[PDB]
Write a protein that binds this ligand. Structure first.
Ligand code: NA
Ligand code: NA
Ligand code: NA
Ligand code: NA
Lengths: 302, 302
């Protein structure tokens, strides 16, 4: 009834978190990796889609931030501004969020909601041994640059849904899995402790996220578009420039881009096969701090 | 350029958090207390006020959640949806947020922003010995109910600002401090380990927050309005029913309501004086799970 400057989130019966869940016990000897995130609904492409998928992917993209640091995720908190009272929406969101948490053994230790334009905040916490974390700032000259899986599917699915690129129903059924349920590379990240010099997940595309590695590490890169892992659909259309743009800078892949000494090539390829991933070395970190991209004819651009 | 279903928050240069700040070392032997929160701007009473104060109080109210659990706050994360690019706004918010953090020795280990209707999410993390936490669910029959300081000032200030109750300029200068800069009772909370049976901060008013203690503890209460600590302004006007409503259920006090055995009365009063607080026993937790409130003439209502 009283109008305060702000509304605050309160415990949600649908999320069902006990107030004693706020206390956790970190494993002795471990450091904790912490990442907080905020997702705002896009009024120009509003998520009028299955709220189960919204919940599932909302956690997944935060689990991918833990993977990028080589951490074992253990706990999450959730706060949500809901634009109207809609019991069906929050129940379905919760189911998908909880499904993703179960798959990755994550406990929800806070779950609160309030009223307002749709906004979802997740904080995720995980464990790493001291000094064994992977950072974006620590890439080295003559590192191989690796990508953990195919790039461009999520962007291609999105382009097709938006009427921007023509896909068949069969092609869209293939790429759409990568859009709606990206699989965070949690076990890979833990396996890369001691082997990778730097890592970051690819959320805003290879150019942007490799770019963040280069800017924070004060180094450059040389990459080959032909070397980048590609799905069957993306590979088939990879002669088209619109598709090459998606491979290099499409959103929402949620693979890891990581760097490592050429000494560890064989061990890293072996890990990739052991986890059923399609990884490749795409290029090399250089001393000269430019990003040069060789297209399919091997001709460079900066 | 590409329209995705959601915009995600990215690291903010104004908040200036290094990517290595995401790794923390919990003190060996301690449990961690974690609280996440979301504040949504109220379009019916929009915060067109000093953003420094918005930043300061945004952290303060989360520090109060740590105080309520008896935890030593150590780390926070921050994510914000900003409704337009306004460098002045975020710089001033940041200054106030950081001022509050400095006062309580809290490190900011994540700071990200995005674009959208004004929404502020804070996650706060602190340390407590195992089993030494204070919860809302653990109040006992024949506990004294304590309040750590005066109630109603923030609500009275707000009512005056909204033209709902007449205050003089001098009276408003007094109550307004409680509205704009509530002081979280961090040291009190730590001092109440071993002494209090239950605790909760009073953010939505005594009736609501004592009410949450009663519902989670499965117990009742008997309280005396005359016993509640009152500021000089609130005390002066405490015969008026509109003011009695503010004392009992005004928002935004951020004092602690806690319960404790009558055996510890003297030690708890001594702590209150040692910290320069104006605390009082306001009543008793009862076996019968009603909330009865005695007004100034001692006549009850349920
Ligand atoms: Na407020
Ligand atoms: Na291939
Ligand atoms: Na999305
Ligand atoms: Na008094």
């Amino acid at each position: 009834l009283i109008q305060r400057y702000f509304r605050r989130a309160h415990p949600s019966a649908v999320l069902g978190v006990g107030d004693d869940a706020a206390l956790i016990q970190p494993s002795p000897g471990m450091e904790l990796a912490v990442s907080a995130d905020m997702l705002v609904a896009n009024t120009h492409f509003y998520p009028n889609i299955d709220p189960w998928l919204i919940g599932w992917k909302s956690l997944a993209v935060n689990i991918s931030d833990m993977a990028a640091m080589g951490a074992q995720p253990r706990w999450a908190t959730l706060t949500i501004a809901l634009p109207e009272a809609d019991e069906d929406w929050i129940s379905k969101f919760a189911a998908g969020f909880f499904a993703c948490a179960a798959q990755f053994d994550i406990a929800l230790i806070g779950g609160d909601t309030t009223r307002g334009p749709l906004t979802i905040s997740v904080q995720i916490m995980g464990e790493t041994p001291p000094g064994a974390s992977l950072l974006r700032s620590t890439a080295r000259a003559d590192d191989d640059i690796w990508v953990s899986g195919p790039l461009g599917d999520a962007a291609l699915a999105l382009a097709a849904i938006q009427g921007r690129y023509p896909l068949s129903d069969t092609e869209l059924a293939a790429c759409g899995k990568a859009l709606h349920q990206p699989q965070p590379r949690v076990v890979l990240g833990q396996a890369l402790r001691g082997l990778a010099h730097s890592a970051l997940d690819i959320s805003d595309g290879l150019l942007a996220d490799l770019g963040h590695i280069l800017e924070h590490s004060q180094v450059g890169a040389e990459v080959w578009l032909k070397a980048i892992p590609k799905s069957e659909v993306v590979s088939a259309h990879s002669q088209e420039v619109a598709i090459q743009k998606m491979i290099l800078s499409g959103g929402d892949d949620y693979e890891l881009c990581f760097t490592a000494s050429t000494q560890h090539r064989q061990q890293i390829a072996d890990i990739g096969r052991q986890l059923s991933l399609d990884m490749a070395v795409i290029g090399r970190i250089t001393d000269t701090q430019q990003l040069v991209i060789h297209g399919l004819d091997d001709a460079p651009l900066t």
